[PDB]
C-alpha cells in the first residue's frame, strides 16, 4: 500500500497539473494505480518507527 | 535550353579482356578496373563502366 | 528527527491559509455573479418591452 | 562470350533516434545499472482548491 | 589469393555489426511507437472527456 506517511513528510516539487476530468473526477475513476484521498487533516503522519 | 549530349557513347573492350572471351566466353566489364580495388581491399567502386 | 515536525506542521498551517485566503476571492467572484444572475431576465422579456 | 557488365549493390540509409522526430515524444536517458532495478514510481500530491 | 579472404571476412563483420547496429535504433523507434498506442484511446472517447 505504498509508504502515504512519507509522501506528505517528504519534500516535494511544485508543477503545474493541468488535465482533463476535475480531479477528484479522475483519481476517483481510479484512473491512477495507487491513491489515498481524504478529506480532513490527516492525523496520522507524524508517527515514526 | 536542355544541356542534351552531343555525341554518342562508346565502349571499347580492354586487350586484356580479349583472352578472358577465349577462356570461358566472358567480358565482364572493365576486368583491369576489379584487378586493383581486390589487391587495396576497397569494396565499392568509384563507377560503373 | 522531532525538529523536521515542527517544521513540517508549520508548511500544514500556511498551506491551509493559501487554500482559505484563494477560497475567499473566489466567493466573492461567486456570490457576485449570483446576484446578477437575479437580476437578468430572460431575453424575449427585455425585447418585448 | 557472354559478356556480364557490372554488378550494383545498394547503399545503406542512416537512421538514427534523436534525429527521428518521433524523439520529441521521449525523454531519452541512459542508465547503465538498469538490469538490476524492479519497478520504479512517482508519487504525487494535490490538495484542492 | 589468401589475402581477398582476410579482406572479405573482414567486411563481413562489419556488415554484421551495421545491419544490427542500424537495427538496434529502429527498434527504439518501433518499441516507443508500440508504447503509445497502448497510451491512444480513440478520439472520440477523449472527445467526450
Same mark, same amino acid.
Given at each position: ?49 | ?28 566489364? !572493365? ?16 563507377? !560503373?563502366? | ?22 477560497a475567499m476571492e473566489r466567493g466573492l467572484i461567486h456570490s457576485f455573479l449570483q446576484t ?14 | ?49
Open positions: 500500500m505504498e509508504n502515504w506517511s512519507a509522501l506528505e513528510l517528504l519534500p516535494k516539487v511544485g508543477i503545474p497539473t493541468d488535465f482533463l476530468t476535475h480531479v477528484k473526477t479522475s483519481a476517483g475513476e481510479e484512473m491512477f494505480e495507487a491513491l489515498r484521498i481524504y478529506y480532513g487533516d490527516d492525523p496520522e503522519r507524524y508517527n515514526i518507527h | 535550353t536542355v544541356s542534351a549530349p552531343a555525341t554518342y557513347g562508346n565502349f571499347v573492350l580492354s586487350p586484356e579482356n580479349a583472352v578472358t572471351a577465349i577462356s570461358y566466353h566472358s567480358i565482364l566489364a !572493365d576486368f583491369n578496373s576489379y584487378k586493383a580495388h581486390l589487391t587495396s581491399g576497397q569494396p565499392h567502386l568509384p563507377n !560503373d563502366s | 528527527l522531532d525538529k523536521i515536525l515542527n517544521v513540517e506542521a508549520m508548511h500544514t498551517v500556511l498551506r491551509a491559509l493559501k487554500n482559505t485566503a484563494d446578477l444572475l437575479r437580476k437578468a431576465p430572460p431575453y424575449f422579456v427585455v425585447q418585448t418591452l | 562470350f557472354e559478356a556480364i557488365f557490372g554488378t550494383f549493390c545498394n547503399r545503406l540509409e542512416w537512421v538514427y533516434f534523436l534525429t527521428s522526430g518521433l524523439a520529441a515524444a521521449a525523454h531519452a536517458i541512459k542508465f547503465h545499472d538498469l538490469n538490476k532495478l524492479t519497478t520504479g514510481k512517482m508519487l504525487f500530491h494535490v490538495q484542492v482548491p
